Design a protein around this ligand. Structure first.
Ligand code: CLA
Ligand code: CLA
Ligand code: CLA
Ligand code: CLA
Ligand code: CLA
Ligand code: CLA
Ligand code: CLA
Ligand SMILES: CCCCCCCCCCCCCCCC(=O)OC[C@H](COP(=O)(O)OC[C@@H](O)CO)OC(=O)CCCCCCCCCCCCCCC
Ligand SMILES: CCCCCCCCCCCCCCCC(=O)OC[C@H](COP(=O)(O)OC[C@@H](O)CO)OC(=O)CCCCCCCCCCCCCCC
Ligand SMILES: CC1=C(/C=C/C(C)=C\C=C/C(C)=C\C=C\C=C(C)\C=C\C=C(C)\C=C\C2=C(C)CCCC2(C)C)C(C)(C)CCC1
Ligand SMILES: CC1=C(/C=C/C(C)=C\C=C\C(C)=C\C=C\C=C(C)\C=C/C=C(C)/C=C/C2=C(C)CCCC2(C)C)C(C)(C)CCC1
Lengths: 73, 80, 73, 40, 140, 143, 69, 744
């Protein structure tokens, strides 16, 4: 039970990290300092500046869904 | 169609026009940089949104920005 | 068993949705001048600390729990 | 020559050398004093 | 008016025009060649451009522009006099490229400035300040 | 007095004794199983026969977690401090990056050997050095 | 007023080096909105995906710089 | 070293030095300037062997390729010598040879430490180790190895050869570097590879089999025991020792030159069946086969014109082949396969992977090495191993076809040839292949779904089974019947069938079955159509990637983007994975899927309707009691009676010599799940997380000068697919090995 409660702690911490990082960078970061101008959900910003796949906060939601399902598992 | 805006941080290196694959951008005269020119987006109805103009931009964060809007045959790049 | 599983899954969905709507608020509704120097603006102002320390706690938990499980195996 | 030493001082060579050295340390420690679950 | 030029020597392919060219729109590239040369077709396979004038119909504008870049970057006497038009099913022809007879890479007088923002990137209005309107930070 | 009533010392647990009578040899030592059965009879065992570890913090079980914790903290502080000071000395070598890829062996060894005093040099740099940096002098992203 | 060699901090918010330090290389004459050429040690993000480094120079204005040495 | 040849080398083009070893990235001008971002590191490994992106000289590239070939041959020699030495001083090859039927082939002893010594299980005769499935002992017995000292000598010879190949690579890249003219001698190279490499190789191996393998094995099967067999060379020193086994030897090599070949019918046989003592192919048959193959290859190695007027010019042959349907035909293909390395690599990878899969299929049903059919673990392991090697080589063939399309394709030299016309109707090709894949998927997997739904609803008579609506593979049954009737009719001199898998006697050696008739029913029909479906989907992905590498209706300038690029932006609706590299990326997954279903079919069918024991009545009791017919028709059958059931050995492997298989089982599962993270996400999120962590390091001045960058999109994909394949293949490796080692 100790080991599995630490697994649950990992799951919660990681899912919340995804969600919080997505919400706090939703207005912008150093790849997209104007990410708020594009909206909550957009495909990306292109391969330029190194590649920008899964940049929006919606992509953070979609990532966090996997870890949430894993935590509930 | 997509919006292609240009800002005052333009240095007029003409790279985004050279990188455009659908002739959306032009080099018009200006007085805000050394090259005495600025980028423009007259033919935005032919923009597909490939972000190449942004990729070829040198300014610290782009001076030219592409915002994907209402999709059409031309923007979706359809040959049918 | 089915009741516990059902309601824990509902709770996971609700939590993910809560954080998604927090990010959506940040994208659409956040006013930096009317909320200047308040709790919200400070949360945004040290977002790197929060994200990095969530990263540390997550790496910590995962590293050590997976290490203990693999040792036991 | 100098280039041979510079190759021997690269990141992968140094990291694998340190990992092998630490592997030997730990393997010998657990060989002579095994099953050390906890300190008395 | 009437587009002139000989079609390139081509045996045919399945990548050419479809029903869009007659239902919706089509495009045309014209160019003069110093000799009978071999070029690559944007729709796949090789073709032979005639010496003199060449007229070629393509389905999309990006295809004509790819052909133009190839003409101007892959041949010993660079072909840069190419022109790209848009043809409609009513037979109407709209000249397109180069817009003002000069390539857009280099500055030329007479051109207006569109999409030019007087402000900086980071000086866009906050979305909350323009919400419940039909505009975005990059539009006001 | 009756603390941890669910657990009993491994010597007093019959399952542990039965299993330890058949513990397997680990190394080439034929008594490795015997010496393991003798060393693990000290700790507390469960109904199954395997020892449980107590991290409650009491110094009766100071070897279960406290001592490995202290040892690892010392060694990991050593590693981190020598790496950090190596990177910082690299910072002032005109070409710091290619010395970060190609490891300066003498400088690296000199930093590593002088690492046994990391917990003192740490507070030395914290009191009035470069350990902590002012927030306004650190590059950040838009909020 | 800034000259060559002036170590300065960038205040452009949207900049990749906002809060970082860069050295002035040259100042273009009047008229230009962003004449102060600042070179940097840390390359930015520019380049196609998978490319090596980035761009280590940009033009700013006087108002967007904080002076150090 | 001319000797009036066409040889042309440069006596000193590259100086020998060690300084460049200290400059990581010397071969790439974009990497020579030193790292600034972490990506610099990764690209250094990505372009390591990308000789085209390092220099535009075809000659220097050919020289680098030649020396790299020599280096790889040295590596394979080192590995082969390691295997031989481990069989020499670390294996029970002699204790096994003394009594194979009661001992397990072991090798690689484990040092007793931290508990791992448990992996050295008892294999027989008191030997403790890890049972090996590579089948090395069977191969060595077929070769005639009697003494471990000879394995040691083979290891020494292999290490000497490795040193030789390494010296040859160094000598031909630094000393005598051959010119570009020398590599373009495709006619000479072909003549030699047919006659010198293949012809002479099989000729010498037939000789070794006649003088070493055949006599020693003839005695070995009769129970003479190894230590009582004379050495292999005592048969060459004493001709009477060869004539006592084969009286045909007593007439000497006089009947050979006089075409009096029938005399040699003592040791050059056409028995066809299997050796009743050991369950392998007759070594007389294999020697006869190597002799015929050698003669064939030598005769073939004379077709092409070199330095004497006689021969065939491949350019004339290719250009002479053109018809009404294909325009100018194969014109320009000579110039392609002479000036492009990637075209050659694609063709050769394709044919070699196909040859490897063919090797697997031909060795599972025609066991060539003695006592290899008895051992089910070795059989399954070799089968799936060659299967995976072939699949990977085929995916690489697609990769290099696309690479040629992007880099070496010249439209000016491909005017109305076969390649031009293929590019001009690629739309028709790919649309029809799309339809064929859909029709197969509906008509293979969909049949399984029908069976699942019908059985679940309590309607067994509505299923596609041998007992309901039958899908009898009539054609394969007819061909099997023809094979079982060939000896004596359509194969007059052949004594027995080519293989008993088509039918005949249920050959069993010791207590187990070696090879019996493999029946084909409704489930076999369904599995074969699943195979066709998956192969078609993989080939569709790869062929579409090749044909559309240069251009498409979406991206008319794709060639200018290169072979390896993530995309061309979110425009045009989205253009991710439009490159040929990404087509290779997807074809990797589909190759994994195809081959996984193939090897699962192999395992279950062998264990169900072939493998098993035989009691002294003729009656055969199979491993899993013939459950293939009634269970391999639904997906629930594969889930329960194949995966759930046969993984019981792997999961309960703890506390035995197979606990490592359970460990690696869990490890492959973990690596698959780990790959999922690289496969489902995007680079931007990770770059933002790295930005936050970089700020955190800036807080304590631990900021590295090499700026941490997230993995590139292409690199993210490569990492994801690599971990996916690794995890899945290791999972099935552990599962198969544990299962086939826990079935007796
Ligand atoms: C079993 C699958 C798996 C694994 C191991 C990971 C691993 C990790 N994820 Mg992840 N994730 C997964 C599935 C997985 N993910 C899936 C399916 C998704 C949906 C796409 C995500 C999406 C996701 C997001 C969005 C995020 C993570 C984060 C993390 C990291 C958090 C640190 C941690 O959890 O503890 C510690 C680490 C581990 C337990 C795994 C590494 C342990 C290994 C075995 C150590 C040994 C290394 C090895 C020796 C190296 C040498 C190998 C050599 C032989 C080649 C971590 C490294 C979060 C993060 O980055 O935190 C900062 C983050 O934000 N994941
Ligand atoms: C990494 C450093 C390291 C250290 C400090 C030791 C420590 C020791 N080794 Mg050792 N050894 C090492 C690496 C190391 N080993 C490795 C990598 C191997 C594998 C080749 C060996 C193989 C080896 C042998 C063959 C022997 C030792 C022996 C010894 C002991 C004398 C000593 C305590 C000796 C010993 O303990 O006798 C059994 C001895 O005979 N070691
Ligand atoms: C072809 C590749 C190959 C591979 C995968 C292996 C694999 C292995 N070998 Mg082997 N070996 C090889 C080639 C190879 N060998 C060759 C070419 C030779 C002839 C020189 C040998 C001769 C050899 C000997 C004499 C021994 C091994 C041993 C071992 C095992 C431990 C190695 C070790 O820790 O040493 C030390 C590691 C470091 C110094 C680091 C290991 C599983 C050992 C073994 O099997 O233990 C019983 C051992 O004693 N090998
Ligand atoms: C009878 C002549 C002969 C022989 C046997 C070979 C054999 C070989 N060639 Mg070569 N080649 C030849 C003629 C020959 N070639 C000619 C005339 C040309 C000029 C057109 C070339 C140009 C050529 C190129 C450009 C390349 C090869 C390559 C190869 C190797 C690839 C196949 C392989 O890896 O198999 C299995 C490998 C082995 C069995 C290893 C043994 C290798 C030894 C050193 C060669 C055979 C021994 C030698 C003939 C002495 C035998 C004496 C005694 C045993 C009787 C192979 C060993 C490729 C290569 O280097 O691959 C590594 C390669 O890049 N060949
Ligand atoms: C490269 C393959 C190879 C090698 C080097 C040899 C070598 C040898 N053979 Mg052999 N032989 C071969 C292929 C080969 N043979 C094949 C393919 C056949 C089948 C036609 C024969 C059948 C054959 C017979 C019948 C005899 C030899 C014999 C011999 C030995 C003396 C002949 C002279 O020389 C000699 C050491 C003679 C011998 O001494 O018997 C051992 C003998 O009588 N050979
Ligand atoms: C004789 C066969 C052959 C030859 C010589 C080549 C040659 C080449 N290929 Mg090709 N290819 C092949 C087979 C071959 N390939 C196969 C079988 C596949 C299917 C996977 C491919 C798929 C393919 C792709 C997708 C690409 C190439 C590329 C290239 C070029 C760059 C080489 C490189 O990437 O550097 C060195 C290689 C690496 C750094 C990869 C290392 C990753 C390792 C192997 C992970 C695997 C794990 C390991 C096997 C087991 C796990 C161990 C672990 C736990 C420690 C090069 C000229 C690249 C290119 O751009 O072409 C110009 C490229 O993008 N090939
Ligand atoms: C089990 C998982 C799965 C399934 C269902 C599929 C499905 C499919 N893939 Mg796919 N794929 C997968 C995993 C999967 N993929 C993964 C993980 C990847 C990442 C590598 C890919 C990447 C990939 C590529 C690159 C390609 C495919 C292709 C295809 C199609 C093949 C054509 C075919 O079989 O006809 C159709 C078969 C089916 C639809 C199967 C289901 C049929 C059911 C049993 C019948 C349903 C009855 C009825 C309609 C239900 C009505 C419901 C009612 C409420 C109305 C097919 C639809 C290839 C393709 O497009 O084909 C041309 C192709 O190019 N896949
Ligand atoms: C079961 C076995 C598993 C098989 C899985 C095979 C995975 C196939 C994936 C396809 C890509 C493979 C081609 C890579 C070539 C390639 O281009 O890959 C794709 C990717 C390229 O990224 P970019 O497009 O950004 O590169 C462009 C640059 O050249 C810019 O100039 O390269 C990387 O993945 C970098 C990571 C290197 C990792 C370095 C680790 C080195 C490992 C050292 C040990 C090697 C193993 C030794 C043998 C045992
Ligand atoms: C149920 C009983 C009925 C069975 C009938 C099945 C056969 C009918 C369909 C076969 C296609 C005939 C066209 C090829 C005969 C053929 O190659 O003709 C020859 C012709 C080229 O010949 P040329 O005269 O140009 O020859 C000159 C050459 O030297 C230069 O290339 O090829 C084509 O016409 C291109 C069309 C090929 C595209 C068709 C391929 C379709 C795949 C068919 C797969 C089904 C069987 C696969 C089993 C492996
Ligand atoms: C003992 C104990 C415990 C615990 C407790 C706790 C809860 C603690 C804590 C704590 C905390 C709450 C902490 C925090 C902090 C902060 C910080 C901030 C720190 C860090 C820092 C730094 C600055 C570092 C540095 C360094 C060094 C020194 C070395 C290496 C390198 C580096 C740089 C990393 C337990 C129960 C388990 C058991 C019993 C008792
Ligand atoms: C011990 C105990 C107790 C106590 C308790 C306490 C005192 C506590 C609580 C605690 C808490 C109290 C917790 C928590 C929760 C949390 C959560 C659940 C989360 C989150 C958040 C979020 C999700 C956010 C969102 C957002 C954003 C992101 C932005 C914008 C804004 C908003 C909000 C939208 C008592 C005596 C009573 C009883 C017995 C036991």
């Amino acid at each position: 039970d100790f080991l599995v409660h630490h697994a649950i702690a990992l799951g919660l911490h990681t899912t919340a990290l995804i969600l919080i990082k997505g919400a706090l960078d939703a207005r912008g970061s150093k790849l997209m300092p104007d990410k708020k101008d594009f909206g909550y959900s957009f495909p990306c910003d292109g391969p330029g500046r190194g590649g920008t796949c899964d940049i929006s906060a919606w992509d953070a939601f979609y990532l966090a869904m996997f870890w949430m399902l894993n935590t509930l598992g | 169609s997509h919006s292609v805006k240009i800002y005052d941080t333009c240095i007029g290196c003409t790279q985004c026009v050279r990188a455009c694959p659908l002739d959306v951008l032009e080099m018009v005269p200006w007085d805000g940089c050394k090259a005495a020119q600025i980028a423009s987006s007259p033919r935005t109805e032919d923009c597909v949104g490939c972000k190449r103009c942004e990729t070829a931009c040198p300014t610290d964060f782009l001076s030219i920005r592409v915002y994907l809007g209402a999709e059409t045959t031309r923007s979706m790049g359809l040959a049918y | 068993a089915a009741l516990y599983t059902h309601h824990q899954y509902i709770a996971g969905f609700l939590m993910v949705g809560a954080f998604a709507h927090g990010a959506i608020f940040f994208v659409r509704d956040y006013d930096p001048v009317a909320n200047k120097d308040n709790v919200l603006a400070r949360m945004l102002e040290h977002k790197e600390a929060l994200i990095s320390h969530l990263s540390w706690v997550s790496l910590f938990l995962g590293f050590h729990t997976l290490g203990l499980y693999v040792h036991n195996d | 020559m100098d280039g041979l030493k510079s190759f021997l001082s690269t990141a992968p060579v140094m990291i694998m050398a340190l990992l092998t050295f630490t592997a030997g340390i730990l393997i010998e420690f657990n060989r002579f004093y095994p099953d050390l679950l906890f300190h008395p | 008016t009437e587009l002139s030029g000989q079609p390139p020597k081509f045996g045919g392919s399945t990548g050419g025009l479809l029903s869009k060219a007659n239902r919706e729109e089509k495009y045309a590239i014209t160019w003069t060649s110093a000799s009978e040369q071999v070029f690559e077709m944007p729709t796949g396979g090789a073709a032979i451009m005639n010496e003199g004038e060449n007229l070629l119909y393509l389905a999309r504008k990006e295809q004509c522009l790819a052909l133009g870049t190839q003409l101007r970057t892959k041949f010993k006497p660079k072909i840069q006099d190419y022109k790209i038009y848009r043809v409609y099913p009513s037979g109407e022809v709209q000249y397109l490229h180069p817009a003002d007879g000069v390539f857009p890479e280099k500055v030329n007088e007479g051109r207006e400035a569109q999409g030019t923002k007087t402000r900086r990137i980071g000086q866009n209005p906050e979305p909350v300040t323009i919400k419940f309107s039909g505009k975005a930070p990059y539009e006001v | 007095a009756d603390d941890f009533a669910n657990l009993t010392p491994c010597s007093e647990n019959p399952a542990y004794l039965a299993k330890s009578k058949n513990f397997l040899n680990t190394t080439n030592d034929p008594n490795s199983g015997k010496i393991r059965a003798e060393r693990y009879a000290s700790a507390l065992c469960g109904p199954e026969g395997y020892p449980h570890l107590i991290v409650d913090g009491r110094f009766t079980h100071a070897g279960d977690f406290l001592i490995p914790s202290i040892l690892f903290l010392y060694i990991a502080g050593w590693i981190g401090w020598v790496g950090r000071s190596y990177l910082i000395e690299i910072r002032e070598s005109k070409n710091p990056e290619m010395q970060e890829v190609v490891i300066n062996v003498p400088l690296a060894i000199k930093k590593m050997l002088g690492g046994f005093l990391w917990p003192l040099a740490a507070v030395g740099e914290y009191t009035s050095g470069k350990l902590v940096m002012k927030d306004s002098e650190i590059p950040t992203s838009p909020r | 007023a800034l000259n060559r060699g002036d170590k300065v901090r960038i205040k452009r918010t949207e900049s990749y080096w906002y809060g970082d330090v860069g050295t002035v290389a040259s100042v273009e004459k009047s008229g230009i909105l962003y004449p102060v050429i600042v070179r940097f040690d840390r390359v930015n993000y520019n380049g196609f995906s998978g490319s090596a480094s980035g761009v280590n120079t940009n033009n700013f204005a006087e108002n967007e710089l904080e002076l150090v040495q | 070293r001319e000797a009036k040849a066409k040889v042309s080398v440069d006596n000193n083009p590259v100086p020998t030095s060690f300084e460049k070893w200290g400059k990581p990235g010397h071969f790439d001008r974009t990497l020579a300037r030193g790292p600034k971002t972490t990506t610099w590191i990764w690209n250094l490994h990505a372009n390591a062997h990308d000789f085209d992106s390092q220099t535009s000289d075809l000659e220097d590239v050919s020289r680098k390729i030649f020396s790299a070939h020599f280096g790889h041959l040295a590596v394979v020699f080192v590995w082969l010598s390691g295997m031989y030495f481990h069989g020499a001083k670390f294996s029970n090859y002699e204790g096994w040879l003394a009594d194979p039927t009661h001992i397990k082939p072991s090798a690689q002893v484990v040092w007793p430490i931290v508990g791992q010594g448990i992996l050295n299980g008892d294999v027989g005769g008191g030997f403790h180790g890890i049972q090996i499935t590579s089948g090395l002992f069977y191969l060595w017995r077929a070769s005639g190895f009697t003494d471990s000292y000879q394995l040691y000598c083979t290891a020494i010879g292999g290490l000497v050869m490795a040193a030789l190949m390494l010296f040859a690579g160094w000598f031909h890249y630094h000393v005598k570097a051959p010119k570009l003219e020398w590599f373009q001698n495709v006619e000479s190279m072909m003549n030699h590879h047919l006659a010198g490499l293949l012809g002479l190789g099989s000729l010498g191996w037939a000789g070794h089999q006649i003088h070493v393998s055949m006599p020693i094995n003839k005695l070995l099967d009769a129970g003479v025991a190894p230590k009582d067999i004379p050495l292999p060379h005592e048969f060459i020193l004493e001709p009477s020792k060869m004539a006592e086994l084969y009286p045909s030897f007593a007439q000497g090599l006089t009947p050979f030159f006089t075409l009096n070949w029938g005399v040699y019918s003592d040791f050059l046989t056409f028995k066809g069946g299997l050796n009743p003592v050991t369950g392998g192919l007759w070594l007389s048959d294999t020697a006869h086969h190597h002799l015929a193959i050698a003669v064939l290859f030598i005769i073939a190695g004379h077709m092409y014109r070199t330095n004497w007027g006689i021969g065939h010019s491949m350019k004339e042959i290719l250009e002479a082949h053109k018809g009404p349907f294909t325009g100018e035909g194969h014109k320009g293909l000579y110039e392609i396969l002479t000036t492009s390395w990637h075209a050659q690599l694609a063709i050769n990878l394709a044919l070699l992977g196909s040859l490897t899969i063919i090797v697997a299929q031909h060795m599972y049903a025609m066991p060539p090495y003695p006592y290899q059919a008895i051992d089910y673990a070795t059989q399954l392991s070799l089968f799936t191993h060659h299967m995976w090697i072939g699949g990977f080589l085929i995916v690489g063939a697609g990769a290099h076809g696309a690479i040629f399309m992007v880099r070496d394709y010249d439209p000016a030299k491909n005017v109305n040839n076969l390649l031009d016309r293929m590019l001009r109707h690629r739309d028709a090709i790919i649309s029809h292949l799309n339809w064929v894949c859909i029709f197969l998927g509906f008509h293979s997997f969909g049949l399984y779904i029908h069976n699942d739904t019908m059985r679940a609803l309590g309607r067994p008579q509505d299923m596609f089974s041998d007992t309901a609506i039958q899908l009898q593979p009539i054609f394969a049954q007819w061909v099997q019947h023809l094979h079982t009737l060939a000896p004596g009719a359509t194969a007059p001199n052949a004594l027995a069938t080519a293989s008993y898998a088509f039918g005949g006697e249920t050959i069993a050696v010791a207590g187990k079955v070696a090879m019996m008739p493999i029946t084909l029913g409704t489930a076999d029909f369904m599995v074969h159509h699943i195979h066709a479906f998956t192969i078609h989907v993989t080939a569709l992905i790869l062929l579409k990637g090749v044909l559309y590498a240069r251009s498409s209706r979406l991206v008319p300038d794709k060639a200018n983007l290169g072979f390896r690029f993530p995309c061309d932006g979110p425009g045009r609706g989205g253009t991710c994975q439009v490159s040929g590299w990404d087509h290779v990326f997807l074809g990797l997954f589909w190759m994994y899927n195809s081959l996984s279903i193939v090897i699962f079919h192999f395992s279950w069918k062998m264990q169900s309707d072939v493998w098993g024991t035989v009691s002294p009545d003729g009656s055969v009791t199979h491993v899993t009691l013939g459950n293939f017919a009634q269970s391999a028709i639904t997906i629930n059958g594969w889930l329960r009676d194949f995966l759930w059931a046969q993984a019981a050995n792997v999961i309960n492997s703890y506390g035995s010599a197979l606990s490592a298989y359970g460990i690696m089982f869990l490890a492959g599962h973990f690596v698959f799940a780990f790959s999922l993270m690289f496969l489902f996400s995007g680079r931007g999120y990770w770059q933002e997380l790295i930005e936050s962590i970089v700020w955190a390091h800036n807080k304590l001045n631990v900021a590295p000068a090499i700026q941490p960058r997230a993995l590139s999109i292409i690199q993210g994909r490569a990492v994801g697919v690599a971990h996916y394949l690794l995890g899945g293949i290791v999972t099935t490796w552990a599962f198969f090995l544990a299962r086939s080692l826990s079935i007796g």
